[PDB]
Ligand SMILES: O=C(C1=C(O)C(=O)N(c2ccc(O)c(C(=O)O)c2)[C@@H]1c1ccc([N+](=O)[O-])cc1)c1ccc(Cl)cc1
Ligand SMILES: O=C(C1=C(O)C(=O)N(c2ccc(O)c(C(=O)O)c2)[C@@H]1c1ccc([N+](=O)[O-])cc1)c1ccc(Cl)cc1
């Protein structure tokens with residue numbers, strides 16, 4: 281329908297915790313073709329995070345159960361088959377986001393900040409795919425994730441301040457990708473620490489509109505470092 | 511060996527908070543035409559409670575957002591339409607459950623305890639329907655809720671002990687129906703007190719198997735009385 | 741809403 | 754099995 285109504289509706293769905301609906305509205309908005317506003321961008325991101333998030337939790341629970349019932353066998357196959365079903369939902373969700381990203385979002389991004397946001401997002405959604413990927417397809421997905429992240433990272437160092445939330449968020453996720461996806465805690469810790477240090481070094485570049493988000497994120501980086509350096 | 515598998519899958523779904531899956535599994539079990547076990551019927555109960563309970567929470571949120579919209583008729587209007595979307599899902603869910611009860615559960619209930627359980631359930635699902643009922647249809651739906659709850663009540667007073675969790679739970683919900691649906695706080699209070707007093711009178715009727723649940727439900731009855739009394 | 745009247749079954753927290 | 758922080762974060 282009207283883009284403006286779809287946004288109000290998305291806002292409504294969010295409040296009602298109907299994330300599937302939220303995502304539907306936001307996908308449609310994106311499909312109209314005009315560059316998303318900062319608000320629409322974040323609503324889209326929110327909707328999909330929650331939608332894919334549901335499946336990620338479910339996958340973890342079932343995976344967990346499947347590994348603990350090793351030796352039980354009949355149940356194990358029950359869990360394996362279910363886990364597989366959840367995986368498919370997940371890929372579909374991820375494939376929807378990535379397509380949005382390639383056909384509409386990354387191409388229409390005309391400012392560095394949104395370009396970085398969307399490329400981070402691409403790195404994130406391929407990361408989610410890497411997590412449930414068939415062994416044959418895995419490497420390709422990991423490279424695709426890394427690549428997106430890399431690109432965003434380059435743009436951000438050049439075009440954004442170290443205290444910018446989106447630059448900080450990228451660093452947070454990119455580092456997690458190294459830790460969790462590549463099993464390279466050295467690079468994960470290096471990336472995080474550096475980013476935190478650089479934000480700390482330019483504490484004076486904090487903006488009135490975003491000093492709260494900056495420090496929350498700085499602190500998230502710290503939490504991860506501490507977690508990893510114990 | 512499908513029925514066992516469905517129950518296994520339902521439990522898996524429950525752990526993964528995938529309630530739509532859970533209920534679907536349990537609906538299949540029911541539709542097989544054989545009388546449910548205490549475990550099976552309770553799994554069914556919970557699954558459908560979560561499924562319908564999401565729409566009820568959502569309905570509440572949107573209704574309140576729609577009513578606190580003093581102005582902005584376009585917002586309000588959109589909220590109304592969204593509310594109507596949610597209402598339809600809820601009726602569909604309710605109608606699904608009711609149909610199972612009418613076709614499978616109630617007809618095959620061979621013991622009073624099961625009969626009461628399912629009759630209570632019928633009262634509950636009709637109650638949910640009454641909450642979103644269109645003016646012209648509300649009276650009939652309210653009557654159907656009351657009739658179901660009444661039949662169960664009668665059966666329970668006759669066949670079961672006052673400390674029986676199902677008997678206690680029925681009183682709990684029937685009292686709430688009076689309070690919330692028929693707007694009769696006095697009857698709501700009377701029914702609840704009567705039931706608590708009767709249970710207390712026959713405290714020696716508590717069983718090894720049910721004593722945790724009986725007492726737990728007695729506290730719930732008291733909770734409602736205290737909230738209504740003050 | 742304040743404290744709401746309890747009904748059974750209750751939703752998983 | 755504690756999983757480190759990533760953004761955006763899931764709604765509580
Ligand atoms: O909920 C949040 C946010 C908002 O509601 C919002 O509006 N943010 C925000 C801020 C600065 C910006 O420049 C832009 C912009 O132009 O896209 C957005 C926040 C935000 C921050 C990082 C990302 N990320 O992609 O990593 C996404 C969103 C939020 C959630 C958790 C934390 Cl610890 C801090 C904030
Ligand atoms: O989780 C619960 C329960 C179970 O897991 C279970 O199996 N219950 C139970 C016990 C005795 C019974 O005779 C039968 C039977 O006939 O099927 C069921 C409990 C039960 C009790 C009341 C209802 N109710 O709707 O009124 C529903 C369920 C439970 C949850 C909350 C509380 Cl405060 C107490 C118990």
Ligand SMILES: [Mg+2]
Pocket residue numbers: none
């Ligand atoms: Mg239970």
